Design a protein around this motif. Structure first.
Motif, mmCIF file in Angstrom:
data_model
loop_
_atom_site.group_PDB
_atom_site.id
_atom_site.type_symbol
_atom_site.label_atom_id
_atom_site.label_comp_id
_atom_site.label_asym_id
_atom_site.label_seq_id
_atom_site.Cartn_x
_atom_site.Cartn_y
_atom_site.Cartn_z
ATOM 1 N N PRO A 1 -46.549 0.964 75.953
ATOM 2 C CA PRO A 1 -46.512 1.170 74.469
ATOM 3 C C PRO A 1 -47.950 1.114 73.972
ATOM 4 C CG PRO A 1 -45.758 -1.054 74.979
ATOM 5 C CD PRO A 1 -46.024 -0.344 76.343
ATOM 6 N N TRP A 2 -48.311 2.072 73.166
ATOM 7 C CA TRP A 2 -49.645 2.164 72.546
ATOM 8 C C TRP A 2 -49.414 1.968 71.065
ATOM 9 C CZ3 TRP A 2 -52.423 1.116 76.321
ATOM 10 C CH2 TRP A 2 -52.318 1.802 77.542
ATOM 11 N N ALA A 3 -50.051 0.950 70.484
ATOM 12 C CA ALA A 3 -49.821 0.630 69.119
ATOM 13 C C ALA A 3 -50.255 1.701 68.142
ATOM 14 C CB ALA A 3 -50.561 -0.659 68.748
ATOM 15 N N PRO A 4 -49.407 2.027 67.197
ATOM 16 C CA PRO A 4 -49.831 2.951 66.214
ATOM 17 C C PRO A 4 -50.628 2.318 65.002
ATOM 18 C CG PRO A 4 -47.662 2.240 65.741
ATOM 19 C CD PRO A 4 -47.995 1.647 67.097
ATOM 20 N N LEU A 5 -51.456 3.149 64.355
ATOM 21 C CA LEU A 5 -52.246 2.821 63.233
ATOM 22 C C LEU A 5 -52.148 3.917 62.153
ATOM 23 C CD1 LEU A 5 -55.542 0.986 64.545
ATOM 24 C CD2 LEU A 5 -53.570 0.018 63.495
ATOM 25 N N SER A 6 -50.978 4.454 62.026
ATOM 26 C CA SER A 6 -50.728 5.573 61.131
ATOM 27 C C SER A 6 -50.760 5.234 59.684
ATOM 28 C CB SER A 6 -49.393 6.202 61.461
ATOM 29 O OG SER A 6 -48.427 5.242 61.377
ATOM 30 N N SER A 7 -50.673 3.941 59.262
ATOM 31 C CA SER A 7 -50.879 3.602 57.929
ATOM 32 C C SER A 7 -52.318 3.295 57.620
ATOM 33 C CB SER A 7 -50.095 2.385 57.429
ATOM 34 O OG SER A 7 -48.780 2.530 57.742
ATOM 35 N N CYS A 8 -53.202 3.547 58.572
ATOM 36 C CA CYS A 8 -54.583 3.219 58.337
ATOM 37 C C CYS A 8 -55.599 4.350 58.022
ATOM 38 C CB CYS A 8 -55.155 2.406 59.458
ATOM 39 S SG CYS A 8 -54.372 0.816 59.815
ATOM 40 N N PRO A 9 -55.202 5.632 58.041
ATOM 41 C CA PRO A 9 -56.104 6.839 57.876
ATOM 42 C C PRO A 9 -57.027 6.694 56.715
ATOM 43 C CG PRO A 9 -54.138 7.278 56.616
ATOM 44 C CD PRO A 9 -53.901 5.936 57.396
ATOM 45 N N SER A 10 -58.221 7.270 56.881
ATOM 46 C CA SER A 10 -59.306 7.335 55.905
ATOM 47 C C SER A 10 -58.852 7.452 54.470
ATOM 48 C CB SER A 10 -60.223 8.521 56.249
ATOM 49 O OG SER A 10 -60.219 8.734 57.667
ATOM 50 N N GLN A 11 -58.100 8.504 54.157
ATOM 51 C CA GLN A 11 -57.538 8.691 52.798
ATOM 52 C C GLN A 11 -56.005 8.563 52.941
ATOM 53 O OE1 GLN A 11 -56.396 11.241 54.658
ATOM 54 N NE2 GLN A 11 -56.048 12.507 52.813
ATOM 55 N N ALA A 12 -55.288 8.172 51.877
ATOM 56 C CA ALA A 12 -53.876 7.630 52.002
ATOM 57 C C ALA A 12 -53.766 6.453 53.048
ATOM 58 C CB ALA A 12 -52.857 8.749 52.286
ATOM 59 N N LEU A 13 -54.709 5.525 52.964
ATOM 60 C CA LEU A 13 -54.612 4.235 53.684
ATOM 61 C C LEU A 13 -53.651 3.417 52.857
ATOM 62 C CD1 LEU A 13 -55.311 1.142 54.186
ATOM 63 C CD2 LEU A 13 -56.997 2.083 55.640
ATOM 64 N N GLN A 14 -52.603 2.808 53.444
ATOM 65 C CA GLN A 14 -51.676 1.907 52.668
ATOM 66 C C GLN A 14 -51.994 0.478 53.145
ATOM 67 O OE1 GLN A 14 -47.585 3.207 52.933
ATOM 68 N NE2 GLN A 14 -48.154 5.379 52.596
ATOM 69 N N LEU A 15 -52.492 -0.351 52.282
ATOM 70 C CA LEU A 15 -53.154 -1.556 52.777
ATOM 71 C C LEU A 15 -52.207 -2.566 53.475
ATOM 72 C CD1 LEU A 15 -55.628 -3.331 53.100
ATOM 73 C CD2 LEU A 15 -54.987 -4.118 50.692
ATOM 74 N N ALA A 16 -51.104 -2.913 52.860
ATOM 75 C CA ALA A 16 -50.158 -3.850 53.531
ATOM 76 C C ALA A 16 -49.675 -3.244 54.874
ATOM 77 C CB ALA A 16 -48.957 -4.096 52.706
ATOM 78 N N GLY A 17 -49.265 -1.996 54.865
ATOM 79 C CA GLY A 17 -48.848 -1.338 56.080
ATOM 80 C C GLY A 17 -49.900 -1.292 57.163
ATOM 81 N N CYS A 18 -51.161 -0.986 56.778
ATOM 82 C CA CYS A 18 -52.262 -0.962 57.713
ATOM 83 C C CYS A 18 -52.482 -2.337 58.386
ATOM 84 C CB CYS A 18 -53.609 -0.487 57.038
ATOM 85 S SG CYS A 18 -54.957 -0.359 58.244
ATOM 86 N N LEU A 19 -52.560 -3.329 57.539
ATOM 87 C CA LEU A 19 -52.708 -4.727 58.025
ATOM 88 C C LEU A 19 -51.552 -5.134 58.899
ATOM 89 C CD1 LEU A 19 -54.232 -6.490 54.922
ATOM 90 C CD2 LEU A 19 -55.421 -5.984 57.077
ATOM 91 N N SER A 20 -50.354 -4.761 58.513
ATOM 92 C CA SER A 20 -49.194 -5.062 59.377
ATOM 93 C C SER A 20 -49.315 -4.352 60.739
ATOM 94 C CB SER A 20 -47.859 -4.627 58.695
ATOM 95 O OG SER A 20 -47.581 -5.433 57.554
#
Length: 163
Positions: free
Chosen positions: A48-67
């Motif tokens: 399993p490779w962890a995703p970081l799809s809530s973290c992109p440069s623009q449309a970063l969603q902060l709670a989701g990214c941190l989670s």
């Protein structure tokens, strides 16, 4: 937080260096010098490779990214642990990498706490691999280190959103 930005960037640096050292030792000790050759095997092993799809440069969603950062760090810690130190000669290098991952993860968790953002569980990606042969532990080392470097390049993005 500027202080948080400074501390997190030096911790990310430190992991990236440790990862590169683990890839160098694996290359020198077992001649596994090419993470791209091992990719399809990794897929077949169900790594399993962890995703970081809530973290992109623009449309970063902060709670989701941190989670996703919190969960992903634990994923990488799990995969490192599952290597069982790869071998007596690699044990110390793997230990340093785990320690530095822990350290960054604690920093992230402290910032989640400051912001009042509890971490969300992520969609499941299936069972941890057992890496149940010497070659699997060796190749798994190469593959996990390589992938962690890439997970950390993305983690740059969120760091400057933490105030």
């Amino acid at each position: 937080s500027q202080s948080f930005l400074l501390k997190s960037l030096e911790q990310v640096r430190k992991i990236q260096g440790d990862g590169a050292a683990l890839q160098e030792k694996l290359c020198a000790t077992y001649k596994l010098c090419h993470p791209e050759e091992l990719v399809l095997l990794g897929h077949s092993l169900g790594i399993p490779w962890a995703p970081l799809s809530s973290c992109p440069s623009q449309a970063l969603q902060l709670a989701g990214c941190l989670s996703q950062l919190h969960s992903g760090l634990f994923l990488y810690q799990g995969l490192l642990q599952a290597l069982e130190g790869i071998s007596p000669e690699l044990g110390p290098t793997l230990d340093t990498l785990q320690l530095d991952v822990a350290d960054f993860a604690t920093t992230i968790w402290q910032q989640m706490e400051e912001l009042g953002m509890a971490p969300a569980l992520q969609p499941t990606q299936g069972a941890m691999p057992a890496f149940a042969s010497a070659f699997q532990r060796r190749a798994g080392g190469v593959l996990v280190a390589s992938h962690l470097q890439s997970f950390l390049e993305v983690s740059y993005r969120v760091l400057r959103h933490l105030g």
